[PDB]
Amino acid sequence: LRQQLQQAEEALVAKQELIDKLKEEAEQHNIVMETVPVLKAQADIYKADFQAERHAREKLVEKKEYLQEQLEQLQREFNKLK
């Protein structure tokens, strides 16, 4: 009897099946990975804009502190006449 070699064959079919599962998953991995370029692009521009927004807003704060002391100074220059 060669029930030894129906072992060499049982495992062998088991391995080929793993290979086929593995490949299916490598395929799925490959599709989902095509999505990365778009995600990378989206993340990049949205980070550049966020930084430009916050930049231009920082610059508003400084231009508004300035205008608060243009009023402050004009009210005190004005009040001394009245």
Added chain:
Amino acid sequence: EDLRQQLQQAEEALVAKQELIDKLKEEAEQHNIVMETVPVLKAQADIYKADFQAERHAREKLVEKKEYLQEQLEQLQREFNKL
């Protein structure tokens, strides 16, 4: 005699089969490592978009204060211009 000797060809396959399995099981591990790049980028896209909107909205609010402050800087100076 040879009716048994066909594992000597089966094991020459049982082996070249972990050849693929490993060049795969280890490819799969770099497949999942680089796959981590996606929830993060996804997170950054829509979180940085949210932050951009919030910053845009605060920019908005500041432009209002900025212009409601020059509407006061004008009409007060028009009265100071009566000298």
